[PDB]
Design a protein around this ligand. Structure first.
Ligand SMILES: Cc1ncc(COP(=O)(O)O)c(/C=N/NC(=O)C(N)=O)c1O
Ligand SMILES: Cc1ncc(COP(=O)(O)O)c(/C=N/NC(=O)C(N)=O)c1O
Ligand SMILES: Cc1ncc(COP(=O)(O)O)c(/C=N/NC(=O)C(N)=O)c1O
Ligand SMILES: Cc1ncc(COP(=O)(O)O)c(/C=N/NC(=O)C(N)=O)c1O
Lengths: 390, 390, 390, 390
């Protein structure tokens, strides 16, 4: 019952920006161009490449592919998801206000709360799953609304089209959607009214746990010009080698995301029927409080499954010590299954009282379900839960 | 007559941080670890690696080597020299003031003037080659003094020890020296009183025109803690692949820099006796106005030579069209000889009236003398100057 | 109606040999170790790494993963499929005889016919699709039988179990199956009686058209010892960087091969009903003469589809000029759709009279169907065939 | 008193084959093109790239640079020095004879003695430092003479011009010189009458202990055609990534080799005056028995120094356990100083009686002197020798 799949996604992921005719060799795969500089025909010629930080063949090719997958006219790549977040925030100026989704990646929270707030920006954290709370938080000084959906790590949704309608009633507010948890294959925020589609390509977009990278996609020529200026001027740019590996990852994005959905749904159903589990959170389950919204704004669901184990922190620790296929590690969106305890790991920097309000408790486990055989994943979770609750 | 050479530099560049015992394999060369994440023995363990952006084996190994070469306790790597500049600026807060050397890389000028200044920072450009002008510009709100020496692109010097003495009479002012043009082999700002030694590793430190990277070295544990927080929280981090290539470049840094000095001095002497050249600028020539200061604060001089061609922009254009070994291109500090026209290329973003005051005229040519045979370089410059002025 | 799928394949492709505990860092992804050499605790210690050609961490990790996917105890990697072929041939000696499948890759034919035959080896080409012809060609001097199934490029099959039974009635004959066209996911020659499973990892195993590599898998400890001696002594070894990229490719092998099968079957059915096509060859179609054998010895079929266009070479040339999604290029098994004319390209070195006997005519087109959207692939073939035959 | 230095070597190492005009981007540094295949304008077009094993942009660019440095018209790259040796041996046929220098790398000995000899080739090991022994070993069946000079590991020389005159009195004998120990910077066998200049680029040519590679340089169009056929048909080809790193290494070859000579000469003089050393071998010392020949056929000497420690294997082991800057490890020609015991390590495969005849005793230590500070290297050797002989 999800939105129908993007129909040319796999074709675009393989071909857009990848014409062999652009290379002297007619290579069918884009070259890795490491050169920092490029010979000019005359001083300050306005065409061709000039300096790697400003633009380079491998990065420019990746940006064309990602733009197509995000349904965007323009894409910019960065050294990390947090570097993308920093660059977007530099669109503003002293005196501006940001509204941020109350539950975000701990590093996003840390950046807004401890860094951006020291340079004349006012930050408010608001539960944007309730559109009336977003409506009430907007002031004439609001210039940016930052929403993750689903949220890291409790997988709360925001209605992107409903939030876009609220913010676009006001003059000059940018809506950013952090699309990291869904990927371009399952959610397209620019088609739902977002002004900026941002993600940590570190996760599903690259998909191989071997690249740290941020991606920012826009339709606005004004936002493109302002962001291009900052990509060049702050210089938080990715290695061309990383651009190559991320481009290589995109070639399998459609088939990886379909497998993450099959495995994720099987894990979520398994946990929901296991008596050692207090509560499962997966947007693809009917039990998710926003399951109907997920079907209205997504084409499917990835491999992110969160659950509350029965008991206390001690039981969560025993579960995470006994997993043998899932690895206790940070990150998500790789081919390999990962598990973490957000309260002690990714969200340790979020104040304890804020974690309590958000439901980031000492029994919340976040799973990133990989591409392994379903039966092997369910046997691993089963035996680890039995070790925690004999 | 320069300061005596650093005596263990080549040994440290090859061995510091490179112990084979730290690798399971006992590899004599550091591995490239691309992994974004690392398996933990228990949740939030305080030791080992956690997440690539926060720290990773290849980057941490490079940072240990660069720290030793800069005479520093601590080193941080960034996605670019401009990302290093952005990260250092985030040490401050709204209401603080920066004093910047009046002549800097065009991108540094653009960042301070057009970006940092919009986030509650006051920026003043001061000729820090005159220590009384630096003294007079300091206010109680000054928190950062940013000096390049020699300057890009007219190779003006600042007396680092004299500037350090002035800023350290006040409470809580950070002195940054951008050491890009000298390299760690020829100038050690932390030994002359700088608080931060910054460079674009894109240039001499890597030396192979195939890595964009920034390096920041400090002795202060307070500055290390604040900068480490921002490396992690802004996420302007380098690829581990780029860290490997930069580490590979450091292994030849001493012998490259000695050859840049031999070739640079030969080019400067050749241009100084050529009647088609109005004026040569090279800190190693007795004709440089600050030659005596260069000998007091450096162990030598690299391959950066600037000159004013006789005549007009038309003659500069004909010279740059006729060079056949030197390539018309941005960047510097590579094995390959490069030439540019800063007024139209690297410094085009600096307002025309500011270029005029700084001496960045339409006849100023910046050379980066590479590692080619001296006779081939002198014949190339000779025939190109003859094409401009028969 | 194919053999049932390998059930732990995806789990093994992700986990076998990839334990984080083997790395000092506990990296969840294998490091790229470029080091040529490794520090020894004492001279000629028998444990640990010694010299990259003899063995190295990245290559040894890939070999463990491939061995599991081939159902093998041992795997050896080489610089190319042809280097694997050369190394296997060096198992023999002057006076030995090789029987080779009559239709093989042009380069395999060239190696046996023009190179191996000059070093005291007698080569006979035999149609091993007819087991009585194999039986009749074996002499007391036969030491190696080399079979490709399906064959490059007309996709003829050999009954591996039936050929194994024939050769194993004799003393000391090695049966090699070149598994390049099926991949480890769809065919397991070691489980059907082959002594050696060889492939060009250049094709499906890597799957991203960015690595040239050969793989050889065995169960015999004797063959492992003899081949390991030759991997080290001929030195036709892969780069650790290439081993990393091939390992990265294996992580998606199961889901890529399932998509190649869906797309390949759709293309084959489309060509079979198109009146501009003389004849389609696809082992998954009931029309293939050996369709029933394919179902008895394989778990599916990949994306290799061959067809004879109606008319002459001129029509084949017009088809190959008008394809806009398929690219005219050598190779196969990549994510991108490729087309070639074997008589003029891959099999040009095979004598014209031998091409005629094998059915490698000037109207035979070989397609490698990639991972693009099925509808886009069928529209591209349709419009190109219409350009050839209005 | 050595031959005068090659005068354009550094210019050629940086520029030959590296024209920015050949790249669409005008990159000043060659791109890494990993593509296995290349789009053709029509089937079997005779120009452009076709298939990575047959030729590719990065490898072809490296081959142009190495050809210039070897004074050759043609260069071919291979997966290793041993793969280059295997490929050259495939120039022959059953019934041909090879004469090999009696002292060679252990792996070269193993290949000729245990592998090539099984394919109808007769191998004779001859002390080619005595030209009358070479003259007497030649028969009408001799087709190849293989000489290393200086030899691995006792640094015996052969007079290349005198050996060339002897073999070229006969019809159709190829003289190969393995130039690994000298590098192209110090010895040019093609200018002294060799038909083939071969080396392990694993050592000095790459110089960074991170690439395994073989290089073969020729002037003959006949040898080029025959070797090109075998590079393509045996497929023992290097990764384009390895070709890039080797090309990057060549940019510093001149300055690295000059430093290896300064450090190597200082180490040799230090060992020659140390009472814990029985005998030092270094071609640059007047004490070397062939010092006068070294000055007639080389432009200098690299960092390879061999010595016999006083006493027994126990003293050699204590020396190799106490070195703290030199590392006990195989290989040579890197920036890092290495030491090995050839009798137990590189030459363990050579029969014990052959080692005795050649002087490869249990007290022979081979040093590869790196690019560290001279004083640090002499202090390390001094303290390690004192640990062995208090
Ligand atoms: C929704 C979302 N947005 C941005 C980022 C930052 O991206 P980067 O790390 O590329 O700077 C992340 C990182 N999450 N990492 C984790 O949750 C973990 N480390 O496990 C995120 O989850
Ligand atoms: C003194 C100095 N500091 C910092 C940077 C920025 O470093 P990055 O480019 O790594 O962000 C540069 C760049 N110079 N580039 C040139 O002058 C050219 N592009 O020719 C610089 O010269
Ligand atoms: C069945 C089979 N076995 C071995 C090889 C050699 O492998 P390598 O090229 O890695 O040395 C190939 C190459 N085929 N390439 C093509 O058909 C093309 N070039 O289109 C093959 O098809
Ligand atoms: C003179 C000479 N020629 C060829 C090779 C083989 O090259 P490759 O290793 O690239 O196949 C070597 C290797 N020597 N390695 C050593 O001496 C060591 N392993 O210490 C050699 O020394």
């Amino acid at each position: 019952g999800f939105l129908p799949s993007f129909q040319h996604f796999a074709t675009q992921a393989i071909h857009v920006g990848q014409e062999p005719e652009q290379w002297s060799s007619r290579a069918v795969v884009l070259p890795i161009s490491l050169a920092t500089t490029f010979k000019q025909d005359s001083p300050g010629q306005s065409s061709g490449f000039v300096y790697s930080r400003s633009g380079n063949p491998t990065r420019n090719c990746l940006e064309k592919a990602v733009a197509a997958l995000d349904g965007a006219k323009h894409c910019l790549t960065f050294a990390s998801g947090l570097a993308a977040t920093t660059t977007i925030t530099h669109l503003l100026k002293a005196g501006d206000e940001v509204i941020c989704m109350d539950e975000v990646y701990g590093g996003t929270n840390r950046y807004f709360r401890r860094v951006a707030s020291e340079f004349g920006l006012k930050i408010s954290f608001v539960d944007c799953s309730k559109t009336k709370l977003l409506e009430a938080a907007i002031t004439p000084q609001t210039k940016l609304v930052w929403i993750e959906t689903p949220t890291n790590p409790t997988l709360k949704l925001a209605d992107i089209k409903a939030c876009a309608q609220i913010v676009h009633k006001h003059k000059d507010i940018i809506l950013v959607v952090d699309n990291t948890f869904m990927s371009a294959y399952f959610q397209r925020p620019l088609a739902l009214g977002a002004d900026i589609c941002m993600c940590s390509a570190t996760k599903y977009m690259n998909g191989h746990s071997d690249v740290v990278m941020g991606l920012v996609s826009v339709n606005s020529d004004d936002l493109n010009e302002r962001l291009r200026f900052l990509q060049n001027s702050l210089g938080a740019v990715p290695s061309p080698f990383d651009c190559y590996l991320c481009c290589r990852g995109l070639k399998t994005l459609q088939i990886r995301m379909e497998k993450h959905f099959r495995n994720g749904m099987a894990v979520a159903r398994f946990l929901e029927s296991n008596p050692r589990v207090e509560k499962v959170i997966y947007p693809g389950l009917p039990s998710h409080p926003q399951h109907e919204l997920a079907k209205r704004q997504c084409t499917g669901c990835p491999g992110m499954v969160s659950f509350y184990i029965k008991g206390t922190l001690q039981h969560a620790q025993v579960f995470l010590k006994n997993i043998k296929l899932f690895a206790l590690a940070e990150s998500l969106g790789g081919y390999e299954s990962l598990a973490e305890l957000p309260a002690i790991m990714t969200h340790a920097s979020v104040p304890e009282k804020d974690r309590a309000t958000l439901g980031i408790s000492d029994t919340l486990i976040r799973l990133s379900v990989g591409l392994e055989d379903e039966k092997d994943l369910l046997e691993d979770l089963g035996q680890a839960l039995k070790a925690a609750h004999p």
